[PDB]
Amino acid sequence: DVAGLTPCSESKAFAKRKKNEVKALNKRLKNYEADSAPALALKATIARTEARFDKYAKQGLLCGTDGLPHLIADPGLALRYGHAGDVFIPTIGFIYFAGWLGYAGSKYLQAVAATAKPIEKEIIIDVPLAWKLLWEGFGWPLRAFAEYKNGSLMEDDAKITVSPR
Amino acid sequence: AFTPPTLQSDTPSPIFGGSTGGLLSQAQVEEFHVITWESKKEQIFEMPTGGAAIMRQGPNLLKLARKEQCLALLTQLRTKFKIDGYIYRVFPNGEVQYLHPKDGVYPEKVNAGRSGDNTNMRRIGQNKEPVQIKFSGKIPAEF
Amino acid sequence: MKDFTTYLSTAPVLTLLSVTVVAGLLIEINRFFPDALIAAF
Amino acid sequence: KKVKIVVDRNPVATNFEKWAKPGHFSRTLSKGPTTTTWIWNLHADAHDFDTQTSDLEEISRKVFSAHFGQLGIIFIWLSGMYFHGARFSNYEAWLTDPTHIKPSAQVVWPIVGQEILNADVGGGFQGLQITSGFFQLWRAAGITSELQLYTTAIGALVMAAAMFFAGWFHYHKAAPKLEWFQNVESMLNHHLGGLLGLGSLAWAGHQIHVSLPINKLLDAGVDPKEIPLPHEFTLNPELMAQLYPSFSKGLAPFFTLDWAQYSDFLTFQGGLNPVTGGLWLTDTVHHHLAIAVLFLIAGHQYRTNWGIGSSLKEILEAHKGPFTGEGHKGLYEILTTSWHAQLAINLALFGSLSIIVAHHMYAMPPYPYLATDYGTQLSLFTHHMWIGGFCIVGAGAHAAIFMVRDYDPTNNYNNLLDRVLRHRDAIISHLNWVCIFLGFHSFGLYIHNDTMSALGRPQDMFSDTAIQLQPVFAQWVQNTHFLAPGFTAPNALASTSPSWGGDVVAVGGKVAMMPISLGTADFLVHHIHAFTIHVTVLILLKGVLYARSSRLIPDKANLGFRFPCDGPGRGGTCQVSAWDHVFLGLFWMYNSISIVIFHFSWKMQSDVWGTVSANGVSHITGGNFAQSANTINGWLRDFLWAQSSQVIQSYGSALSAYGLIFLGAHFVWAFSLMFLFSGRGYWQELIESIVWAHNKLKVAPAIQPRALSITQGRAVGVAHYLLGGIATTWSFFLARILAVG
Amino acid sequence: AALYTHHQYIAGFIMCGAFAHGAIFFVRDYDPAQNRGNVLARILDHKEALISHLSWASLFLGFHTLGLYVHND
Amino acid sequence: GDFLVHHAIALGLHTTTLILVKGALDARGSKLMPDKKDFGYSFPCDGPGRGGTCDISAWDAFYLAVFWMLNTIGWVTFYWHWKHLGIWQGNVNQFNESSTYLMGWLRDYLWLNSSQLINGYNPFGMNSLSVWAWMFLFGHLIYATGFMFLISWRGYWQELIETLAWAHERTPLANLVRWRDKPVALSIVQARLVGLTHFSVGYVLTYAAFLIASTSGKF
Ligand code: CLA
Ligand code: CLA
Ligand code: CLA
Ligand code: CLA
Ligand code: CLA
Ligand code: CLA
Ligand SMILES: CC1=C(/C=C/C(C)=C\C=C\C(C)=C\C=C\C=C(C)\C=C\C=C(C)\C=C\C2=C(C)CCCC2(C)C)C(C)(C)CCC1
Ligand SMILES: CC1=C(C/C=C(\C)CCC[C@H](C)CCC[C@H](C)CCCC(C)C)C(=O)c2ccccc2C1=O
Ligand code: SF4
């Protein structure tokens, strides 16, 4: 109970929603024979729905007035109440992966900028170099922090074009 | 010194069937332009008002609503036919003003003896700020 | 096959293959790990 | 002189070296992409062969091989449709019960909850309900087997491989010369007879030996499993004589010209088959045979390698009258030497053909059980309408392109092209006046009706119950068609379509086709259609006529067909090019076709489609067109709000994909408004600020990012606008017609 | 509802007018000589940073709000 | 749903501020047009040179930002009206589980509350809500008439006006009268302003009609 929300393990409307979904899928079932391919497909869909609802009740999600999971996007409020996987852990995951992709692209730009024809290397991508830099970009946070402390990550303003005010 | 050529009024016109893009009501009460050129053979050209016309051997006379039409015809004569021409500005009261080849040679070639007006001796960024010319009826670039 | 591999290294071929492999990886992730609302470890 | 095959042995080497370097085809794309404008221009000029080479021979060879590649793509598409009908379809189940089982030929993989899109179509099958009508076409052809669809898919894959091999062979091994492409006499003689005539004759042969017996057994009522295979119907005339007794005497009455004995399978009744609601297949056989004979006769008009025949140039140059000067002098040369003029003519007649197809296929269905499936009917009509309108706009575009590039005033003196160009102001002014008059007397009638309804004066609005505006000419034409059999059509046992008049054709409890009555609302919407068509014609014709020159800009031909403007001078010359006229005509065609398909859907949901109850017909919307389609609030409420409840409440069902696309297309349409309303300078300056941000972190691309060009922005905006609007209408139509019917 | 919507639309129009008149003051009444080193010249000096960060914030908000809405749809 | 619509409002404010601030700061000059301060606050363009200079003045940035202001205030007032419609009916749930996804916004708010509005007049009669139905269709008409000036630009219209001037200058029985002022197409800035004015008028009239009809007809 972090903001007037109840856990979906004990909230009644979550179970009501699960029952309604399973009942609708059973209403879909009650038209085919037991061993037909549509019957197997609907049975798989039912199993997936029950597994999803049981997993959501297991993971400790919060449900509001009705049975819909709510996520917490405050560190501390999610850390001490055990919901860091709602926003905080995916925040760290996205920051890592986006930094990996962006650092790989950046290093490709600075690697092909000092070649004979940097114009050609951006439509005709050197695949081994791109693969190597994509691998090297997995250590993007340490490399980026090192280049920031070295001062080689940013460019001086006196070497950057601006408009004449 | 150079003298402008006179507009010989009794000059033959190119063969043409009659267009809808020709002269209008502006010609009677403001102005209509005219272009004169010398052609070495009977051949077909394109009118600025639409359609095809045949200019005849010798002098050819064509009047047009605007000066831009006259220069379009002159430049297509100069490119696709290598033919020079003269453009005149004809007022409805009777006065005729010579126009494009004003000093004989074309404006893209120097003549030594022209007026070099509207030529500022500064850069683009050396104009005055608009606040320093505030409430004057002039743009910063004509100071 | 140098020219053929250069064509394969051209920007549209590489971006289509890259979005194809990324989309396929994400699709198989959702196939084996469906309905992952949160990063519950 | 002397039509013959001339080719060049091995003109272009086959290798991958130009695949490595994009932009090789044009000189202006050389020396690398200095900006992203190079990237956009590379796709912009990929098919502009005039800017690639100056030789008409190389352009013709490129066009020929591009046609072969397009044919290969179409064959791949057909193979895919037949393969999906074979493997992932309920076609055999649908054949047993076509009245109740909804056709489906595409299934989805259960990945992210998307298995809900697999509908309960019937026959123990789950899949997306298709609206393309392949099931009806296959039943008309007499398939009734899964293996035959797979065999056709394999054959179409083989034909696609053949098309691609032909294109490679005719660009790289034996490329035809320029004079081969200019044999228009031989090309017409072979397309009239050997393509269209022989194709119609071959389809008549198939229909005789395959479609007639199998569909006859299906109509009499037989499970398709025990129906004899098509070959054994073709193999001996015994079974054929059991089904059509005229086959007992064979080909003897044909060669002795006693053709009246073939009247059991070469018929002429008209109307529809009451079992299926489609046309009589014997009537289609007779039609195909007659038009095949007509086309094979038409294929001997033109002179080739022998003295018989008439030359196209001779027929053209002799059609000169006093009002037109030289007449058709120069038309043969500007059509045998310019591809864009032929493209304009062919695109115009092709789009008109597609529209005529849409009309003739709703009016009177040619396939069994096509009328009863309202979904495929509405989808087919709307699809062909949109294809026709697009092709017509492209015709205007390529006429403008020919006027800019391939128009030479030397060989076009005082001819019809010159005569039209010399009085373009009259034509454009008069079309402008017609457009204004039609806009007033169509839209202002609706506005007057709105005002009188909102003022509480229903007696003063234009309606059937007040001030009548009856389509008397159209109603009398319907009467003439209805009274045609037995009078002006003595050999017809029924009218061509039930739309003219007569009894309601009902198949499986649903109306196949019933008479359509025209009232005041139909009058108003037909005048709206005329107004929209006239304005689209005005824009396209104005672009074509003023592409060369103008009073405002006398040298527009120098600036080209596709240029943004000629500066802010002369008050402003934005969108003066013929390209921008095509750009505006695209929106106007969109408006026109949208109103046409809205009228179609409302009119047949209100007065045609419905169920029978042995005491009347219960229409889908209940006759609301006659009292609400004369008012804009009626269109907004009784059609555009009432029928929209099916697509917005489609979440959680099989139509949830249509519901999602209904919103995504709104998003795309409003996304177009960015490109349509804004201008390049703002985006360029914003990109400058972003480039500063990239320079600060050393992540500046060597290829300089530029804002989209003005023509680029207009093209992106119009593409997104038309895509969003058409997809919104498509999702709405399909969800509404698949949820109710 | 009418009062709220009226005042909100009036506020939006008036704020656009405020920014338009600020642009006019930069075009017309801005003197770089007497505004040399002060906060106006400072904010004009690094205007690329301001515009780029507004672009980043708008891009982030549009991406994330639209993505969440479409995922929910 | 309040979270999502608050981020929508934040996006609207941020983008409108972006356009307006960029127009102010680039008003004196940019890299595409360094001497923009000499040309004034409002001008059409700088011609098709340098790749194209459409909508380059600060006036054009204000012009683009008015659309974003209208969209932002539309989001704000849609949020307010739907929330209070849920409150006044006693059904806060309709907003609570329908504002989190956009189909709920389209169906449970725009489609649902417009039922009494579009029935202000019908073939069966009319009532007091007819004025708001007429204003609804009126605002739609003004909005699309704005789109007319927004999409089409000055050049097609100038040629058309020249053609009609040719028509009138030599139509019999109408050559007796002539224009004192030469008919010309609207200038680029002028027609941008006209399209923006029609856009704003149609926006405001349409939403005022819908809001007043859907609240007064229901309460
Ligand atoms: C890997 C290349 C790369 C990198 C490192 C950056 C980095 C940055 N961009 Mg940028 N951008 C890129 C590509 C890149 N961009 C491309 C291709 C486009 C055109 C679509 C843009 C368009 C763009 C805009 C309009 C803006 C930024 C902005 C920014 C800054 C804000 C952070 C951000 O992520 O914004 C968001 C970035 C994007 C939305 C574009 C991401 C597109 C993909 C994911 C990146 C390309 C991947 C590349 C091909 C990988 C190559 C791998 C290599 C081994 C070959 C930041 C420093 C903002 C800014 O100025 O902040 C102040 C801003 O307004 N970018
Ligand atoms: C009876 C002879 C005949 C036939 C049947 C065709 C048929 C066709 N021609 Mg062709 N043509 C012919 C004679 C013929 N032509 C002659 C004599 C000339 C010289 C004047 C040309 C010059 C010509 C040009 C320049 C073009 C065509 C094109 C086309 C295609 C039209 C587009 C389409 O999609 O149609 C419908 C599609 C089909 C009916 C699919 C069936 C395709 C099969 C393979 C047709 C086989 C007929 C072929 C002539 C047989 C000889 C080739 C053999 C060695 C395999 C079409 C298949 C256009 C095209 O698309 O290029 C490919 C086009 O560009 N023709
Ligand atoms: C038989 C049909 C046909 C043919 C052969 C041509 C051929 C040609 N056209 Mg044309 N045209 C046609 C029909 C046709 N057109 C139609 C129907 C229209 C109306 C829309 C037009 C309107 C048109 C214009 C306005 C122009 C041409 C131009 C051209 C020339 C260059 C094309 C090019 O390379 O640009 C590039 C082609 C592309 C970049 C392909 C992409 C185009 C769009 C983006 C595809 C649409 C998206 C598609 C529906 C997928 C949507 C789903 C998506 C979400 C993935 C070329 C000779 C251009 C020219 O300069 O003439 C000399 C010119 O500007 N055409
Ligand atoms: C709903 C918005 C809208 C409206 C009303 C119009 C209206 C018009 N367009 Mg247009 N257009 C639009 C959107 C719109 N367009 C958009 C978005 C685009 C971008 C693609 C275009 C692009 C476009 C082009 C390219 C062209 C037009 C043309 C025309 C005119 C055709 C003449 C006519 O219809 O006769 C009658 C007029 C009407 C039906 C308008 C409504 C008049 C009402 C019904 C009656 C008048 C009574 C009046 C209100 C009483 C006065 C009251 C007093 C107090 C003022 C017409 C005025 C064409 C043209 O110039 O003329 C041929 C032209 O070529 N439009
Ligand atoms: C205290 C408020 C205030 C004041 C004193 C000014 C004063 C001024 N403004 Mg400004 N402005 C304001 C607020 C204000 N503004 C607001 C709120 C906006 C946002 C909309 C603007 C946006 C704006 C722009 C973009 C420009 C000015 C300009 C100007 C200057 C010249 C005015 C002009 O162009 O002539 C008179 C103005 C008009 C006649 C307005 C035109 C009429 C409008 C657009 C149509 C209204 C139609 C109506 C709503 C229809 C009714 C609907 C019904 C029929 C259904 C002037 C010093 C111009 C300038 O500085 O020159 C460089 C300039 O271009 N203003
Ligand atoms: C529905 C209409 C619409 C939409 C979606 C946008 C969206 C946007 N506008 Mg815009 N605007 C509009 C209408 C619209 N506008 C109108 C009518 C005007 C008046 C002319 C303006 C005027 C305007 C100005 C003046 C500016 C913007 C800016 C922006 C960008 C702000 C950044 C952002 O929020 O990131 C959100 C991103 C999106 C909403 C794009 C959607 C995400 C895509 C679909 C993901 C890609 C997936 C897939 C690959 C799509 C391709 C499919 C294909 C390959 C088949 C953004 C892309 C500002 C800007 O450039 O920011 C820096 C800017 O200055 N707008
Ligand atoms: C939370 C709260 C608080 C606090 C507060 C604060 C801290 C403050 C503030 C405030 C603010 C912060 C406000 C504001 C706003 C703003 C705005 C709205 C803006 C603006 C600007 C502009 C619009 C500009 C213009 C211009 C230009 C454009 C250029 C030139 C110059 C000029 C200026 C003209 C308290 C506790 C006390 C109480 C409760 C609540
Ligand atoms: C937004 C906008 C821009 C900016 C547009 C840009 C910079 C193009 C952005 C394209 C990016 C770089 C690629 C995005 C790729 C997408 C993921 C998918 C795009 C679809 C392709 C596959 C075709 C203009 O340049 C412009 C010019 C003239 C009038 C209006 C406008 C205009 O509205
Ligand atoms: S606004 Fe754009 S299209 Fe119009 S004249 Fe200026 S540069 Fe050309």
Side-chain angles (χ1 to χ4, degrees), chain D residues 31-80:
Chain D
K31 297 180 190 294
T34 64
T35 49
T36 63
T37 316
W38 187 99
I39 292 161
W40 299 121
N41 294 348
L42 159 66
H43 316 97
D45 311 304
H47 306 328
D48 215 340
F49 301 152
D50 308 340
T51 80
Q52 299 175 13
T53 186
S54 63
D55 192 13
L56 200 57
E57 197 169 81
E58 186 169 0
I59 290 174
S60 304
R61 292 159 167 183
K62 282 193 197 193
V63 164
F64 201 41
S65 277
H67 290 182
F68 273 125
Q70 164 84 87
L71 267 176
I73 292 305
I74 293 182
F75 267 121
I76 284 169
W77 167 74
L78 273 185
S79 184

Side-chain angles (χ1 to χ4, degrees), chain F residues 109-160:
Chain F
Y109 174 62
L110 286 195
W111 177 90
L112 196 47
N113 296 301
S114 68
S115 183
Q116 288 184 24
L117 162 62
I118 60 180
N119 287 274
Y121 58 95
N122 44 55
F124 291 158
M126 61 79 71
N127 50 11
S128 70
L129 286 188
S130 182
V131 70
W132 312 105
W134 202 84
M135 181 174 314
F136 198 61
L137 277 297
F138 194 58
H140 281 91
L141 190 54
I142 303 183
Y143 178 95
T145 314
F147 269 36
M148 184 177 177
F149 305 95
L150 294 174
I151 293 173
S152 69
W153 283 5
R154 189 205 197 277
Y156 173 90
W157 307 104
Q158 184 54 49
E159 301 208 302
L160 211 48

Side-chain angles (χ1 to χ4, degrees), chain D residues 72 271 333 400 485 667 715 723:
Chain D
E333 298 71 55
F667 180 85
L723 181 89

Side-chain angles (χ1 to χ4, degrees), chain D residues 674-675 678-680 683 687 707-709 713:
Chain D
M674 199 167 40
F675 300 92
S678 61
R680 189 187 185 281
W683 303 103
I687 279 176
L708 302 183
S709 81

